[PDB]
Amino acid sequence: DPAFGANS
Amino acid sequence: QVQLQQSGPGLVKPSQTLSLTCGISGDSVSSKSAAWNWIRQSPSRGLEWLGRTYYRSKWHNDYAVSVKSRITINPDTSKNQFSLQLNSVTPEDTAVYYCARGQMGALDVWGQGTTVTVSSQSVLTQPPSASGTPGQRVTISCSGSSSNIGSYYVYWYQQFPGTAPKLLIYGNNQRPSGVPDRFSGSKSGTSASLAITGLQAEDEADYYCQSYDSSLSGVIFGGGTKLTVL
Amino acid sequence: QVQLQQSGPGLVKPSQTLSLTCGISGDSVSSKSAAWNWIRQSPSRGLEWLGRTYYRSKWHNDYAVSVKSRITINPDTSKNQFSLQLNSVTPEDTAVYYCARGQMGALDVWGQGTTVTVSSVLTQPPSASGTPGQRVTISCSGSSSNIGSYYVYWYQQFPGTAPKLLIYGNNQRPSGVPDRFSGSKSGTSASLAITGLQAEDEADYYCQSYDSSLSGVIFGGGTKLTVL
Ligand code: NA
């Protein structure tokens, strides 16, 4: 989820 | 603490527009760490993510494939709220609608939900049902692909009937404070697992696996697993 | 006594043909009182009637509008089985496929179901809940084109299992179904009632009718019933 600085 | 208050009609005529409003308290709608989602749920469509809006130096909008051409999610910075607009509704759009906050890919805070009736790859793979006897360790699996689980975080939710899903596992294997350590998560390749040690009658609920798919450009949910304690 | 045996590939490449067979035993494919249907259950769309084939001194073929240009149900009297030929498959065709016998419009005998991977007007309340022993009701709103002028059927479905017939012909109850279940039809509205709810009734309940505008079998969105 690229919407955050939190993905992968 | 952060709470979300939902408002909207419980019935919309076909071909008409459904409008929902979600009020925020304890957080800003322009938060750099938050994203504001809409999710609906029905026996036919399952747990279906609808879309989201969020602020990263500008307002962004990510919509689901299924409702992209009919959906609009606008934030209101003054009233500190965000709305849902779905045009040309049909009986298929009959579901329970939730607004939820995403903070790290996890839907940690949910609204109580609004039942909306309309009258005159895409889904992660979970076992339809799981079961176990008290005291056992029970594990629920979820298989995906490189486009989703193989490349992104895995989240788990616990949902008791008539209530919004509760965050159980975030970031594959991390656990929010308050959640007992009986619940554990794991991820390897394109598969994930939710383990419940010391199974209790309390654990009888529906369990959902959640991730993100780059090919779908949106949040993807699993079919959900109904856990029965024998 | 009638058994339907399903078979066929689980994974189908796009732009190709899905071939699913339904072996019949205990009954004849040429039965004058039976119809042979195919229903799929999309993980994000739900129950979806594909079509049927039957014989009344002449073979008949009824198909859904959304698949009519690429669907075909082939009967075989020598083998006593009928097949599902779905051509030019897309990712939208990924679903659990069921074959079922139609009697008086009622889908009384279902197949196990085949999960196929490729890599609508009826209205019900999303969820329902009741406490053991309580009488609960599940309603379904239609219109003049379906419920208003045709019979109503009801089905119960557990996770991973084919739908089970509960009520046929608006308010007729088949043998094997306890007297706890009952139905009724009022104008363009139908209702399933569970008098004396038990814990074993936790399932998804679907209402079925027939639309003349779509000229095919129509299902409802389904209702999730919870026993507290
Ligand atoms: Na990263």
Numbering used by the authors:
A (entry chain C): 20 to 27
B (entry chain B): 1 to 9, 11 to 31, 34 to 59, 61 to 72, 74 to 109, 113 to 128, 1001 to 1009, 1011 to 1030, ...
C (entry chain A): 1 to 9, 11 to 31, 34 to 59, 61 to 72, 74 to 109, 113 to 127, 1002 to 1009, 1011 to 1030, ...
Would you copy out the relevant sentences from the publication that reported this structure?
To better understand the structural basis of 2H5-preS1 binding, we solved the crystal structure of 2H5 (in scFv form (single-chain fragment of variable domain): VH-linker-VL) in complex with a preS1 peptide (‘59C’) corresponding to residues (−10 ~ 48) of pre-S1 (genotype C). The complex structure was determined by molecular replacement and refined at 2.5 Å resolution to an R-factor of 0.23 and an R-free value of 0.28. In the complex structure, residues 20–27 of the 59C peptide showing well-ordered electron density were modeled. The 8-residue peptide adopts a U-shaped conformation and is situated in a pocket formed by five complementarity-determining-region (CDR) loops from both the variable heavy (VH) and light chains (VL) of 2H5. The interface between 2H5 scFv and the preS1 peptide buries a solvent accessible area of about 460.8 Å2, accounting for 54.6% of the total peptide surface area. Five CDR loops (HCDR1-3, LCDR1, and LCDR3) are involved in direct binding to the 59C peptide. On the buried surface of preS1, which is mainly involved in heavy chain interaction, the Asp20 residue has an electrostatic interaction with Arg55 in the HCDR2 loop. Additionally, Arg59 of the HCDR2 loop forms a hydrogen bond with the main-chain carbonyl oxygen of Ala22 from preS1. Phe23 in preS1, which has a large hydrophobic benzyl group, inserts deep into a hydrophobic pocket that is formed by Ala38, Arg55, Tyr57 and the backbone atoms of HCDR3. Phe23 alone contributes to 23.5% of the buried surface area of the preS1 peptide.
